[PDB]
Amino acid sequence: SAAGYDRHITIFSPEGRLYQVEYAFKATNQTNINSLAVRGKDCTVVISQKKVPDKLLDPTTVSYIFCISRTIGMVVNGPIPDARNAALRAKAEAAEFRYKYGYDMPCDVLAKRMANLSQIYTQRAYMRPLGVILTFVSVDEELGPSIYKTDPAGYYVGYKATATGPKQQEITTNLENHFKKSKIDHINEESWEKVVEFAITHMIDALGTEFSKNDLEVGVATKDKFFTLSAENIEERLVAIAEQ
Template identity: 55%
Template sequence: MTGSIADARASVDRARGEAAEFRYKNGYEMPCDVLAKRLANINQVYTQRAYMRPLGVATTLVSVDDEFGPQLYKCDPAGYYVGYKATASGPKQQEALNHLEKKLKNKEHAPGSWDEVVELGISTLSTVLSVDFKKGELEIGIVGGPRADGQEGTDTEFRTLTEDEIEERLQAIAERD
């Protein structure tokens, strides 16, 4: 989420409530695209009502769907939502989007394994911000990467990378350059 912290907290609480209610009513987890549409509809109502202040937050949703695989959606305060291969939010959003567009042009998705995709994200940030990162300066979350317990297979749960894993990715980028 990017934007107002208070609005982000309210939006996250609302999204959790919507997902919990959907699961209770339907017996399965709410798909990412359905949640994105619901949040966009709620945001759109906030922009139309004169007595309601629009939410000042852009929401990025990431999930691994059983039917469609990895999904990425972004909702803006005006009620617009769209699916992406890769996206960015924040002050240098357009520069990051331009960089990602050049790297992923004419591709269905980011090529390579999870670690190469993480390296693409780090290199995009590094290029846009003109900064060489250290392991303690980044926080990276992944969905669908290797299991945290070291066993075989992929983990469909969200988790943050450890500083050692981030250091490995930074080393791989440095060696590649």
């Protein structure tokens, strides 16, 4: 029920469960966006919804995909305060690592350390969980296309493809159908443009909702560079699908 428990993160229940942590898996659907990250054979694509619900905002600034470092992108689902705050740690650990060890920080090592740091925030009771799912994408300098999703508890596992947000279940199902049916673990194109197009299609299928360039934002990690596509760059892609 509740008797102390949920008011703290150093209080376990009869079950050994730490309740407050579970509330952040409910706190990351609070932006209402949904993400899709997919793998090809020379890229990883990560796509999130772009909500500009009042025209009193500038549709440009809106995004939750942040460039963390040259080779690392990241999508944030869940709150704007915790988005920036997690980006600060990520930006900083990525820079420090670069200079400590002299060499770039892999998708996995950035994913690993962010989780540990979060774990220590659950161990102590002057901190709290940052209630965001962070999905890091990079094309590795040694393991090629990669996706690591970091959950608010601080679990991390890799993926072929992944979805996040409230409407995750439908996207899970689509993506299962896709790789099962191919019997290979990746999208087969060697043109990164059609993989972005393909990612788009899946996303429309899974959600049931057709999109516009005001309702997408797209990040693309390729080997040795990262770029976020602008609105007119997305737009080009949509008119390839609609009439192939």
